[PDB]
């Protein structure tokens, strides 16, 4: 059945190449070669995590027959109130070394070994502000002792935490900031969603002034909202049988937000 | 009954000539002529005991006229909390000699005498971490006194045991890692399992995108799960009079895990 394939596709996810993703990758590649620690900051729907995943999937783990994998880029995400033993546990599991019982100094010495053995060049830490304040001692340690570009990723909250400690703020001063879409850039991106992601069989002409008064007001320029609003309006339109979105149905979806 | 023949076949075991198995045997052959002790590490479902057993089935015992049997590779698995006596008892029994009522320092001398007499070149100790910490002095004594390559085989815990003692870490510093399946290697292996192991009269063609999604989720790259799952699907399917494994019966199996 035609409809149910589109409804499955629309509920799925994809990475669209956009300027903000391209701009991050060309900055992270510079920090990887120069071995400089830095931070990516921005608001909570700008798509930082998809940009960092898109980067992890560029540099894939290279393999040699009998050796640990060569892993240029590591990406981890801590749990809330992450302690030193929880951070080390995750870096070790990511490199596919099983983690045995031990004390914090065992976990430290093992994490430092596997980061050298796998040839890591960059360590991307998402939601960095879940780290307990003391763990930053171990993050600065990794970054000064090993040739690793630590990237901290997070919202404005992160800097409020970081400014509480000079020792950290100064390792992590260099920053790239993610912003919101506007003007021609919002208008152009809506057309990329229409053609590349929604793939509706009648064009919805979403770049028209009457559609863009809806989308600009409702999405406020966030790529997270734009993907959510348009997939919902496409699911709702196709399940009602229309071959494209229309002014009243997009109004019905936008009224909830 | 033709059907009763097939279920007796699928219930059993067989060895598939995977690249990872070929990679181990080529590495251990360098170590056997060089006479260098080493260790093999990796996760518990990656193929390690089977890859070591296949190397023991190569290099089976010689028997020239008027000599003892020459036995180039010895392979053993200790029992849990294996003591200094029990290790010597296993090495002696693998070499077909009977052993009679010794004190441990008799078992030691009789082991050294048969290890010399049988011309042993290599000793593969599977689940090496079942060894009690004090037995490693007897393993180092075998490795230093005789011209023997000892291969310790085990999981990431083995490393945790070895790192507790400098004396051992240094004799056994070199190592190879067994790892999980991925990407085109997982797909090629599933195709090989279908034609090599399952042999149903009609093709199931499991390399099809829709079916590899079920298997990748169900197996997470372990060669262990892949085999169990494909066997259980052939057994169940055959008991119900089907000519193939299909989409629905394969999901019925994988849900149990």
């Amino acid at each position: 059945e035609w409809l149910q394939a589109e409804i499955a596709r629309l509920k799925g996810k994809s990475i669209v190449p956009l300027q903000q993703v391209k701009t991050l990758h060309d900055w992270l590649d510079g920090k990887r070669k120069a071995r400089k620690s830095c931070r990516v900051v921005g608001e909570s729907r700008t798509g930082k995590t998809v940009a960092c995943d898109a980067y992890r999937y560029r540099h894939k783990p290279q393999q040699e027959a009998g050796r640990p994998p060569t892993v240029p880029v590591v990406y981890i995400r801590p749990h809330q109130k992450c302690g030193p033993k929880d951070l080390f546990k995750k870096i070790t599991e990511y490199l596919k070394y099983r983690v045995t019982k031990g004390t914090v100094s065992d976990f430290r010495d093992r994490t430092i070994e596997v980061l050298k053995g796998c040839g890591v060049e960059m360590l991307i830490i998402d939601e960095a502000d879940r780290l307990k304040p003391e763990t930053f001692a171990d993050v600065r340690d990794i970054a000064e002792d090993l040739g690793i570009a630590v990237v901290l990723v997070g919202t404005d909250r992160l800097d409020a935490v970081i400014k509480r400690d000079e020792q950290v703020l100064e390792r992590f001063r260099a920053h790239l900031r993610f912003g919101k879409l506007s003007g021609e850039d919002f208008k152009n991106t809506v057309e990329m969603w229409e053609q590349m992601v929604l793939k509706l069989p009648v064009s919805s002409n979403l770049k028209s002034k009457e559609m863009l008064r809806i989308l600009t007001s409702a999405t406020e320029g966030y790529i997270g909202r734009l993907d959510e609003i348009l997939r919902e309006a496409a699911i709702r339109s196709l399940s009602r049988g229309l071959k494209k979105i229309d002014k009243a149905v997009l109004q019905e979806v936008a009224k909830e937000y | 009954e033709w059907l009763q023949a097939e279920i007796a076949r699928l219930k059993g075991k067989s060895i598939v000539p995977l690249q990872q198995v070929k990679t181990l045997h080529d590495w251990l052959d360098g170590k056997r002529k060089a006479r260098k002790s080493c260790r093999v590490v990796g996760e518990s479902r990656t193929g390690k005991t089977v890859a070591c057993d296949a190397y023991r089935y190569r290099h089976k015992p010689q028997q020239e006229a008027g000599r003892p049997p020459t036995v180039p590779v010895v392979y053993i698995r200790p029992h849990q909390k294996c003591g200094p006596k029990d290790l010597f008892k296993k090495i002696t029994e693998y070499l077909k000699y009977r052993v009679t009522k010794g004190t441990v320092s008799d078992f030691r001398d009789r082991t050294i005498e048969v290890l010399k007499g049988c011309g042993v070149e290599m000793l593969i100790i599977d689940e090496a971490d079942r060894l009690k910490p004090e037995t490693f002095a007897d393993v180092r004594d075998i490795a230093e006194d005789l011209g023997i390559a000892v291969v310790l085989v085990g999981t990431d815990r083995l490393d945790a045991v070895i790192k507790r003692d400098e004396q051992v870490l240094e004799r056994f510093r070199a190592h190879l890692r067994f790892g999980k399946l991925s990407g085109e290697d997982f797909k090629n292996t599933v195709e090989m399992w279908e034609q090599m192991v399952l042999k149903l009269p009609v093709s199931s063609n499991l390399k099809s995108k829709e079916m590899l999604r079920i298997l990748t989720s169900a197996t997470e790259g372990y060669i262990g799960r892949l085999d169990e799952i494909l066997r259980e699907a052939a057994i169940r399917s055959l008991s119900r009079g089907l000519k193939k494994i299909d989409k629905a019966v394969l999901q019925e199996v994988a849900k149990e895990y």
Partner: peptide, 14 residues
């Protein structure tokens, strides 16, 4: 331009 299914990059990564 190409646009990547996020689960396809997840499948193709090591």
């Amino acid at each position: 331009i190409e646009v990547w299914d996020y689960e396809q990059l997840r499948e193709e990564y090591g």
